[PDB]
Ligand binder design. Structure first.
Ligand SMILES: *[C@@H]1O[C@H](CO)[C@@H](O[C@@H]2O[C@H](CO)[C@@H](O[C@@H]3O[C@H](CO)[C@@H](O)[C@H](O)[C@@H]3O)[C@H](O)[C@H]2NC(C)=O)[C@H](O)[C@H]1NC(C)=O
Lengths: 230, 112
């Protein structure tokens, strides 16, 4: 199969430049069309650009003309996207997609869409600086038990920028896990709380650990959740 | 006749291409084999040249215009001192360095 791997999250300043990379596995690089798309938080998709590396002349949207550069490297089989003169509305999730094309002769190329998608990379520009996340264990108690099911979890506070990945038991437990979306407070930082409901009989026998990762601050915290001592 | 304009300018030699074009195809057992190989080699050279011309988009032509712009780093002489004060033997000795780049550009321009 064909797979695309992108870089990590990026935080920049107004007027600076950002560069993203996308590496492909499973196809011939020179004859496969690669495209860069973006999605703003809460809005739709916006096709930024795309090209076939063999032809060598990329296509751009007139809105992003003069600010976007798409290049390729066949030795590393990686496509690079450079965006300059960042503005306040450039914070978004950028996707790298791939598709197949053919030729009918005389410079005509026919496409089929974007069948392969990357995982996306979050790019944010703001005047704030990086901040390590703070983790607090929402410990289950008698008030969190209803019909033999008790809820527990972990809350993340005082971190910037997005995103932060939360997992339970290194991904062993997925059922009943709810990760509420992050919100913005008046302090300018984000916060969230990821909870999980488990049978009350497993509180004293099963160990629950929430693993949180904040890549821009390169922070990895494993917090153990146990019922509060009383 | 043949090779008559070898000392004339590039412009004058552009009107007699067919003379050189025609003189490239027909103009014991030990000796019999040697003569046959010469004819086979001439046919092969002619066919390779024809295939190259066809690939460049110039099939069945003696003069062919292309869509590849002329880079000024290949030569800086203007048209007045190239087609009127120069021969092909001198032009080849000057552009021998950039021939492969131009050929590759022609191929990739015609294919795309
Ligand atoms: C045709 O042959 C190519 C090359 O042998 C095959 O590409 C290979 O595809 C596999 C997946 O099927 C790739 O493995 C993946 O690689 C990375 C790194 O581990 C990761 O995305 C996955 O965990 C997985 O292991 C493999 O790298 C890739 N090989 C190359 C050289 O790119 C292709 O699958 C074959 N196609 C068919 C239809 O059989």
């Amino acid at each position: 199969e064909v797979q695309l791997v992108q870089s990590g999250a990026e935080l920049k300043k107004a007027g600076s430049s950002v560069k993203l990379s996308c590496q492909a596995y499973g196809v011939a690089f020179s004859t496969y069309s690669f495209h860069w798309v973006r999605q703003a938080p809460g809005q739709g998709l916006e096709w930024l650009g795309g090209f076939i590396p063999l032809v060598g002349k990329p296509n751009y949207t007139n809105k992003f003309r003069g600010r976007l550069t798409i290049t390729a490297d066949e030795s590393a089989r990686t496509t690079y996207m450079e965006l300059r003169s960042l503005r306040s509305d450039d914070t978004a999730i950028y996707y790298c997609a791939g598709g197949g094309a053919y030729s009918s002769g005389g410079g005509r190329f026919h496409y089929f869409g974007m069948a392969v998608w990357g995982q996306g990379s979050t790019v944010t520009v703001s005047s704030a600086s990086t901040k390590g996340p703070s983790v607090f264990p929402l410990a289950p108690s008698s008030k969190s038990t209803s019909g033999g099911t008790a809820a527990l979890g972990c809350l993340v506070k005082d971190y910037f920028p997005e995103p932060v990945t939360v997992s339970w038991n290194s991904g062993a437990l997925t059922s009943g896990v709810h990760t509420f979306p992050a919100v913005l407070q008046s302090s300018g930082l984000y916060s969230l709380s990821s909870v999980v409901t488990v049978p009350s009989s497993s509180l004293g026998t099963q160990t629950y650990i929430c693993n949180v990762n904040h890549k821009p601050s390169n922070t990895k915290v494993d917090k153990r959740v146990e019922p509060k001592s009383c | 006749g043949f090779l008559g304009a070898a000392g004339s300018t590039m412009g004058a030699a552009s009107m007699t291409l067919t003379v050189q074009a025609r003189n490239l195809l027909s103009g014991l057992t030990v000796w019999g084999i040697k003569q046959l190989q010469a004819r086979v080699l001439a046919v092969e050279r002619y066919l390779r040249d024809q295939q190259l011309l066809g690939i460049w988009g110039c099939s069945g032509k003696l003069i062919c215009c292309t869509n590849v712009p002329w880079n000024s780093s290949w030569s800086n002489r203007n048209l007045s001192e190239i087609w009127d004060n120069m021969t092909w033997l001198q032009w080849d000795k000057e552009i021998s360095n950039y021939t492969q780049i131009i050929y590759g550009l022609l191929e990739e321009s015609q294919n795309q």
